[PDB]
Amino acid sequence: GGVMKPHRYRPGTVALREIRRYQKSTELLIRKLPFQRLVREIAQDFKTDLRFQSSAVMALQEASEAYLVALFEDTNLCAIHAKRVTIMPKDIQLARRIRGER
């Protein structure tokens, strides 16, 4: 008999499918609890035994995700400018340089 495995999707097709799915939805893309642990670890270096409201961690996760999404949008535009379709560390560093954060 035998299982007959056909050809898979070409590289990029599932990627574009994810592009459309995540640009159409609104749920958070970062895991809430690991991010909360990251927030408490970063806050540790200023005041010991700091407490956070859940809405504060949620506002930080929203702000963080919006900032990274906008940075990757700018990175994608500079990447596509340079005749590539693959972003590189240099691209993000260029984005931050032009934005004035460096």
Partner: peptide, 17 residues
């Protein structure tokens, strides 16, 4: 400004197609 739980506009670069 960032609108909470709003996402972004659907915008796919032409070159990605």
């Amino acid at each position: 400004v960032t609108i909470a739980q709003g996402g972004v506009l659907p915008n796919i670069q032409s070159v990605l197609l």
